[PDB]
Amino acid sequence: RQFVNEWAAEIPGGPEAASAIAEELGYDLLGQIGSLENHYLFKHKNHPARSAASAFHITKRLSDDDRVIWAEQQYEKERSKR
Amino acid sequence: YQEPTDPKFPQQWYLSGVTQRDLNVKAAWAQGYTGHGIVVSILDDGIEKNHPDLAGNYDPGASFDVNDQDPDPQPRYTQMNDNRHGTRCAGEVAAVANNGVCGVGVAYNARIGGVRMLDGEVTDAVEARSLGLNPNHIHIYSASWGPEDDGKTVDGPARLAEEAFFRGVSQGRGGLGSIFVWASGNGGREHDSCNCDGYTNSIYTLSISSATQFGNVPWYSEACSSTLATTYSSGNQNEKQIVTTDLRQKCTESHTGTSASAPLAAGIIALTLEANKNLTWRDMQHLVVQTSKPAHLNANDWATNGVGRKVSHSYGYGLLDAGAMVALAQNWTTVAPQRKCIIDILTEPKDIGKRLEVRKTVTACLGEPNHITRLEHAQARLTLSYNRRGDLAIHLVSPMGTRSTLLAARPHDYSADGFNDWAFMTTHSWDEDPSGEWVLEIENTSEANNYGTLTKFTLVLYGTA
Ligand SMILES: [Ca+2]
Ligand SMILES: [Ca+2]
Ligand SMILES: [Ca+2]
Ligand code: NA
Ligand code: NA
Structure with a gap:
């Protein structure tokens, strides 16, 4: 399993909060995730793009933030055509 | 109304047949429903938007490239034609009719789009962005893909995808709900069970299984209780397969698997939405339950439930019946x-x-x-x-x-x-x-x-x- 340096998070404060979170925690804000309002995708500025290891302490900092309902590190899923 | 004149339409046995072993789509067309005003999007490896049988129905408002982050879902051309799959599915739904090219789509007057999202790294975010694209413009999403069909895997939508499903059905289509049509899987040879696949197993998806031309359970079929209904697809080498648009502006008669069954269902559902545009996402599942026909499908586990309907784990409630679907929808x-x-x-x-x-x-x-x-x-x-x-x-x-x-x-x-x-x-x-x-x-x-x-x-x- 390959984890990627992308994190998703639900942020009720909206895009201004998402922007603050990105600069304070060391992310580039990529934007809202599709039509899910208050869900945003981030890319960490220093963490490697692909790794077999999860980045547990990065995730904890993001989800522990009082502006974040939840967060998860993205990873590459095995999906097949049928 | 005249039935399509397209050269390969006679080979689309599943649309029009002499033998009553078809999806009764002609009766829907004859009632006047061809998918006009309905928008369908194929979530797959891209859509050849300039294909002669797709261009007239192509809708950029129903398309996006999530893999490369651009608005153009054009497939990536390779020597081995790896990215032909979404074009084959798009043709079953909405290939243009009466234009001298290949065959026709079930909803040949519908608008068709593609989300290019499988030709790259697929993450929870990728899936959620695809499932939630333009949910007040796209009415129906068709997805053939899912977790590995190896018979070992238990996997479903993660949190973002699960949220996109729920927001889709609750807020999509102005509150009536996005219609997600899903293929039940190809793991029959591995004795896979499609309840171990959280995409098909979801209540928010209309899960479709396959039947061979002669009415049998294909080798690749997966049984499970979450399947809703069935459409025709490939089988043995004496049985015919699905005729549709193929990459590099070609026509194929060899589209196979449950990935060929789900787009046919999305087409039939597009005809049904045209017949009643106020149908909710649950209304549509009710219609499939009541109008699907077990009669021509051979199964070892047909059983009558408590309201008198026959149901199989290979087929759900049986074969889709487009003519009965559009008819029941009008005064639903x-x-x-x-x-x-x-x-x-x-x-x-x-x-x-x-x-x-x-x-x-x-x-x-x-x-x-x-x-x-x-x-x-x-x-x-x-x-x-x-x-x-x-x-x-x-x-x-x-x-x-x-x-x-x-x-x-x-x-x-x-x-x-x-x-x-x-x-x-x-x-x-x-x-x-x-x-x-x-x-x-x-x-x-x-x-x-x-x-x-x-x-x-x-x-x-x-x-x-
Ligand atoms: Ca592109
Ligand atoms: Ca045609
Ligand atoms: Ca499976
Ligand atoms: Na928090
Ligand atoms: Na389902």
Whole structure:
């Protein structure tokens, strides 16, 4: 399993909060995730793009933030055509 | 009205046949429904938008490239034509009619788009962005893909995808709900069970299985209780296959698998939406249940449920019937708002051993706002430990006696991970009365000495009052 340096998070404060979170925690804000309002995708500025290891302490900092309902590190899923 | 003149239309046996072994689509066209005003999008490896049989119906408002982050879902051309799949699916839905090219789509006057999202790294975010694209413009999303069909895998939508599904059905289409059409899987050779696939197993997706031309269960077919209905696809080498648009502006007569069945269903559903544009996402599933035809499908497990409908784990409620779908839709009364009754069955963990039976009488949330007297979907959310998962078979019996196989033996699944609040879904008790005794059966189908414990059994009932 390959984890990627992308994190998703639900942020009720909206895009201004998402922007603050990105600069304070060391992310580039990529934007809202599709039509899910208050869900945003981030890319960490220093963490490697692909790794077999999860980045547990990065995730904890993001989800522990009082502006974040939840967060998860993205990873590459095995999906097949049928 | 004149039936299509396209050169390969006669070879589309599943659309028009002399022998009554078809999807009764002609009768829908003759009633005047061709998909006009309906927008469908194929979530796959891209769509050849300039294909001669797609260009006239192509809709950039229903398309996007999630893999490369651009608006153009054009497939990536390779020597081996790896990215032909979404173009083949798009043609089944909305290939242009009466233009001298290849054949026709089921909804040949619909607008068709593509989300390029499989030709790259697929993450939870990728899936959610695809499932939630332009949900007030796209009406129907067709997806053939899912977790590996190896017979070992248990996987479903993660949190973002799960949220996109729910926001889709609750807020999409101006509140009537996005219609997600899904293929049930190709793991038949591995004895895979499509209830172990959380995309097909979801209540938010209209899950479609396949039948061969001669009316049999294809080799690649997966059985499970979450499948809703069936459309034709490939089989043995004497049976014909699906005729559609192919990459590099070509025409194929060899599109196969359940990926060919789901787009045909999305087309039929597009015709049905044209017949009644106010149908909700649950309205559409009700229509499929009532109008699907078991008659021409051969199965070893046809069973009559509590409201008198035949249901199979290979076929759901049988073959889609487009003419009956559009006919029933026109004066259909929108169903009551969805209710959800959550019932905790266990007071303590139960040893499984060789066999476990859990019986429980329920009131289906009597005296509460989510009281249900007419069932739609039903789930058994199970949490259990076990040393050898694939040796388990799990059944759920409703008060009216309908036996749903939630999980069949999977000879290749040697996992010791058990199930972690995994929601096994059945459609087989649709419209039944939910109150009374439900029975859960868990058995070790093997002679080997296996062991485990069921720690949690949440019965979740969806429906109306
Ligand atoms: Ca592109
Ligand atoms: Ca054509
Ligand atoms: Ca499967
Ligand atoms: Na927090
Ligand atoms: Na489903």
